[model samples]
Target chain A: GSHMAITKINDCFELLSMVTYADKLKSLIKKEFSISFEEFAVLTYISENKEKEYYLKDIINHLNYKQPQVVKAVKILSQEDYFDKKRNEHDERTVLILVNAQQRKKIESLLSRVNKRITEANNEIEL
Target chain B: GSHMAITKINDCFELLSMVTYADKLKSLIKKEFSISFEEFAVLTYISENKEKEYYLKDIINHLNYKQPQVVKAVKILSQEDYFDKKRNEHDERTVLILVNAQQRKKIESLLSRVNKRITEANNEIEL
Candidate 1:
């Protein structure tokens, strides 16, 4: 043995393993015109919150996302025609993002499969 | 909608999710000391193959790691008193690694908990 300590446990090995599992999920969801796992997660969250006027603040407080992450996701979501945003009727500072019914249909069809793959991949690990 | 096509799906979102789960696993195992996830995975791989002398080529073929990744892991494992390696008598070109019995005992005691945490963490994800 070298001079290093046997002190450390549970290192970055899980980083690789987690990434490996995530890669499997990515490949499964990626067929033709594939979106990113990031984008997929953002859309799924919005779709699940379809009833409310979901906003950046909601994402910051309710979800794990931060201001930059929410901004980036919203940017892509709007760019992809997945949804639209409008100024909140009550407050100009509070912008509301909305996914159309048709867009929701698209997001759901995609999500039902995504949630399944992620679920199964974890199953394979006995986790 | 922004000008981007609904063209891209599955962005880097899962990167966060996977990392988050990994962080959970890390924190759980990091109470006293923490080894890298990379080193842990390598040690696990080596311990699993204790019957035979494991080598770098074996790591490349059996594990998902590349040459550099394997090399780095083996270096840490050897440095931290986890194992020792000597040139294989059969083939000097091929170095063989051996984990000492005492070290093996240490690794197993630690691993029993790790395997469980990893399993539970995955279960919580419904994967």
Candidate 2:
């Protein structure tokens, strides 16, 4: 019973460090890549489900960022050339998020490395 | 080839939930207990290592809060009667932090329940 409780505390500590480390990861990336952590998260989510071709709301649910926040990040992604942003012709208001078919492989490789650095930073924490 | 990296990402997701769940847990505890999350953290750390009768610096190291923050929190606990504030006779500079020996069991019990609530709230998360 006690072990389970201790486990919870450790888990919380783990998360605290995660958020802290995310900040570090973002700062390093922003120095060269011009991507915010939120933007990267948006990119990664779409990239993983790149096959489904998600709309903004889908990413919003998981990230729970405000609509404006997600919208802004998505636009920045599009403007920065990582995504090919589109609007729905039929409905006139849908922003269909996308990546180039070939660009996906390159972006995925970059994200994989970024993610690896995140995990390594996380693992390196002694506390 | 990528299992190690996948593990890193999974670890990050776990921390992501930890931060989210903590917000929920903190709101509930704050509503009834009238303590800040920082205060609770300070209390728990001291309680777990209660044997040392730890000084303020000891708690600050773990919390990484500025001296003013820890100083403020320790005072509140003392004022609230969870701790015994003492001016060490020999070392006038040292502010001694104390938990009521008799009160230790009660506080520990309360903390256990709070921790359980934290863990349960953590477990309830499906995402």
Off by over 4 Å in 2: A1-36, A86-94, B1-34, B65-69, B86-96, B103-106
i-RMSD of model 1 (Å, 1 decimal): 16.1
CA lDDT, candidate 1, residue B57 = 71
User: What's the TM for model 2?
Assistant: 0.67
The residue-level lDDT of candidate 1 at A107 comes to: 73
Q: What is the lDDT of candidate 2?
A: 0.61
Residues A8-124, candidate 1: write the lDDT tens digits. 113334444454554555565665338654566677567655653566667655445456776776777777777776544685555677777787777776666666665565566
Estimate TM-scores for all models. 0.61, 0.67
Report the C-alpha lDDT of model 2 over B23-108, residue by residue, as the tens digit: 45567667757777567767777665666376665677777556687778878877777778665556544566777786677667
Candidate 2 lDDT over A23-99, as tens digits, reads 45456556656666567667666655666366666788877556787888888877777778786658755587777
Candidate with best DockQ = 2
